């Protein structure tokens, strides 16, 4: 998910489940192959000492300025209408600038996102509908216009984009401590046999 060949859109964010394995979390921290890395509640180097029930990786690409919206208690076009996190988000977020990989002359139109929605999303909710955002009482008849707007739009990921507009491969790591027994934990140290 950190180095996937192709990523999903923001409003159509994909998810990958992690369980039944050993997960070394200190690798990415010491890799220095990222643009931003911040964990909520737990330090990134302490995660190897914790075991969890289920861990998901929500992958998508955004602009640089939109990275501030992915956090607990934020709001905006992406936080509200595309991908929302709960106020109790105790996960982690990794970002990596992919302008040399995902950017395209004319803009990568395959990565799109929602600008308007009739209602705000829930935590970890996904909506890939094409319903026209209706502002007035008149019907849109499936076409934008006066008080009607097509909510989905494409990104301008061009090579000449700045820090705030270039593409950034982002992955959100949500942890879950349920009543069920654990399924994934960090690696334990070892030494020679005396």
């Amino acid at each position: 998910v950190f180095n996937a060949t192709r990523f999903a859109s923001v409003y159509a964010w994909n998810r990958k489940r992690i369980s039944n394995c050993v997960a070394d979390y200190s690798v990415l921290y010491n890799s220095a192959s990222f643009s931003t890395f911040k964990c909520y509640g737990v330090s990134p180097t302490k995660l190897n000492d914790l075991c969890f029930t289920n861990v998901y990786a929500d992958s998508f690409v955004i602009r640089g300025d939109e990275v501030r919206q992915i956090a607990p208690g934020q709001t905006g076009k992406i936080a509200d209408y595309n991908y929302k996190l709960p106020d109790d988000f105790t996960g982690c977020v990794i970002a990596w600038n992919s302008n040399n990989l995902d950017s395209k002359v004319g803009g990568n139109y395959n990565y799109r996102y929602r600008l308007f929605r009739k209602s705000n999303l829930k935590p970890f909710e996904r909506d890939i509908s094409t319903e026209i955002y209706q502002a007035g009482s008149k019907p849109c008849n499936g076409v934008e216009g006066f008080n009607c707007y097509f909510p989905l739009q494409s990104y301008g990921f061009q090579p000449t984009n700045g820090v705030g507009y270039q593409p950034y491969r982002v992955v959100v790591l949500s942890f879950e401590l349920l009543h069920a027994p654990a399924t994934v934990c960090g690696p334990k140290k070892s030494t020679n046999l005396v």
Partner: protein, 597 residues
């Protein structure tokens, strides 16, 4: 639910689409100026035509949102840019005729030429030849021929073309609820719907009129000095009490006295500041000049430039096969991408010009976070005025001494200061009443108070009264002098120079106070004053989301143009010009002409 969502959603839709479409035209223009080719100019025009068509179609929904009961200024300013029809109000025949007139006037002006009576085979074009005749050549005959024949060859032919330009434009303006195309230009500073910061269109005519008489005490003292100095060069044509001839001003249009410095040197035996040899001695290049220029912008406290800024910038002309436009131009390619085009050389002339272009980028990069329709300047003055204040501080010897270009042993006194200060007044003081003169004349032509037959008649009247200039040969009703100007023929507004000039000293005095500089402003230097850049960036970031008067109230202490900091900059100059006119006459006498007998 409410109607406001239609405007918020429409502008957001436009701000998303127009942002990418405009940068395609802006980036296409970058490619042309970097490589002048038939393929680049074609895509440049196609991209501009593409974004132009998008602006017209988007005006449909923009007009369906009445702003009568709307208080949100952000929604009002953005829609008003699209609600205006502009040239689309008239039929295609009237609009096509306007472009045909402007295309013809630009060709007649650009391809204008004057040739000597004694050498019909040897003569020059408008550029670069005739510019040097008024600027460099000191011959009374060459300067007179270049002025008079230019008015007959180019001025007369542009008279009938300027009539259709004024008539067709007034129909376009009047359809958009204006009095005339003069009022259309004055609407750039228009403000409404904001208490304590509103601004009417007619206020600009009162401001330039009030500030003009405030400039007269300084201009009248310099005019007698320039007349007294030129009288010694041309005593058989210039009276000590009369007016200055129009062909001895220093250019083909009578706007700047910058070229008359050689004839008006205050102290021809004193030195001046020049770090051209200093830069060559220290092995400076075009890159180091821009890098060392960036050191000044961070020292004052403004943001730094990115890596792609310098790596993708132009510093010279890449060969003749791919010749680029060497003119200084600050570009905003978009998506956080900014660049500058300049063929920089190792000299003090390009040292200050680099700071001027970098000052422009500080303007655009500040309000880059605003919406696309509001990602522009509040008015014409704020755009170019902010660029001059940064280059003026760098020209101060205090900064050059700090960086290490000008040696610390360079002695400074009131004498050497007057040479630099008086030379500037030839550009500032010798141009301010001329812009007020020309725009007042044009504004009267658009309104229609001056008949078309009285253009040259009233133009000669305004010249003797306002500026105190007289033609070398009398002109009849068939001539039209201001029509031969670049800005007039190419449909531009020249009043921005008057507003930019006064706004330059307004912002300078505000930042000099931020730097705690005491005394006249010509010795001011904001280098290594972090608070100065912070005070500026608070004004640059506003863009055009707030009133331009509010930018002045919180920075320069006023709401309109003012002449107070003009005297502060030229404070010791007024005493100098007060002395030199003890053997001359302050002001001018309109009864004298060079062709008098």
């Amino acid at each position: 639910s409410t109607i406001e969502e239609q405007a918020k959603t429409f502008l957001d839709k436009f701000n998303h689409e127009a942002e990418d479409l405009f940068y395609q035209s802006s980036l296409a223009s970058w490619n042309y100026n970097t490589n002048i080719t038939e393929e680049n100019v074609q895509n440049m025009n196609n991209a501009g035509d593409k974004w132009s068509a998008f602006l017209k179609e988007q005006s449909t929904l923009a007009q369906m949102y009445p702003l009568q009961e709307i208080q949100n200024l952000t929604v009002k300013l953005q829609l008003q840019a699209l609600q205006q029809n502009g040239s689309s109000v008239l039929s295609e025949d009237k609009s096509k005729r306007l472009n045909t007139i402007l295309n013809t006037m630009s060709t007649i002006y650009s391809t204008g030429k004057v040739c000597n009576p004694d050498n019909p085979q040897e003569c020059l074009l408008l550029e670069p030849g005739l510019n040097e005749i008024m600027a460099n050549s000191l011959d009374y005959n060459e300067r007179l021929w270049a002025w008079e024949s230019w008015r007959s060859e180019v001025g007369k032919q542009l008279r009938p073309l300027y009539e259709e330009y004024v008539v067709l434009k007034n129909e376009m303006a009047r359809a958009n609820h204006y009095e005339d195309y003069g009022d259309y230009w004055r609407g750039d500073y228009e403000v409404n719907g904001v208490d304590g910061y509103d601004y009417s269109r007619g206020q600009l005519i009162e401001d330039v009129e009030h500030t003009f008489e405030e400039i007269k005490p300084l201009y009248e003292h310099l005019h007698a000095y320039v007349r007294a100095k030129l009288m010694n060069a041309y005593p058989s044509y210039i009276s000590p009490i009369g007016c200055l001839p129009a062909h001895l001003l220093g250019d083909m249009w009578g706007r700047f006295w910058t070229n008359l410095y050689s004839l008006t040197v205050p102290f021809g035996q004193k030195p001046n500041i020049d770090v051209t040899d200093a830069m060559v001695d220290q092995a400076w290049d075009a890159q180091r000049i821009f890098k060392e220029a960036e050191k000044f912008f961070v020292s004052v406290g403004l943001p730094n430039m990115t890596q792609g800024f310098w790596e993708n910038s132009m510093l010279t002309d890449p060969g003749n096969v791919q010749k680029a436009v060497c003119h200084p131009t600050a570009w905003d390619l978009g998506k956080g991408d900014f660049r500058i085009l300049m063929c920089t050389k190792v000299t003090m002339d390009d040292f200050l010009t680099a700071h001027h272009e970098m000052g422009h980028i500080q303007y655009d990069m500040a309000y880059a976070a605003q919406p696309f329709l509001l990602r522009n300047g509040a008015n014409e003055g704020f755009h170019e005025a902010v660029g001059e204040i940064m280059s003026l501080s760098a020209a101060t010897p205090k900064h050059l001494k700090s960086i290490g270009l000008l040696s610390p042993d360079f002695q400074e006194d009131n004498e050497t200061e007057i040479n630099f200060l008086l030379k500037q007044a030839l550009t500032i003081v010798g141009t301010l009443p001329f812009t007020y003169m020309l725009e007042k004349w044009r504004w009267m032509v658009f309104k229609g108070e001056i008949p078309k037959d009285q253009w040259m008649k009233k133009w000669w009247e305004m010249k003797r009264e306002i500026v105190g200039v007289v033609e070398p040969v009398p002109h009849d009703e068939t001539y039209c002098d201001p029509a031969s100007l670049f800005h007039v023929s190419n449909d531009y507004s020249f009043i921005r120079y008057y507003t930019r000039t006064l706004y330059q000293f307004q912002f300078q005095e505000a930042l000099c106070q931020a730097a705690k500089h005491e005394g006249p402003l010509h010795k001011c230097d904001i280098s290594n004053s972090t608070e100065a850049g912070q005070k500026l960036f608070n004004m640059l970031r506003l863009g055009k989301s707030e009133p331009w008067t509010l930018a002045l109230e919180n920075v320069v202490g006023a709401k309109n143009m003012n002449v107070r900091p003009l005297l502060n900059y030229f404070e010791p100059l007024f005493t100098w010009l007060k002395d030199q006119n003890k053997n001359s006459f302050v002001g001018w006498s309109t009864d004298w002409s060079p062709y008098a007998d």
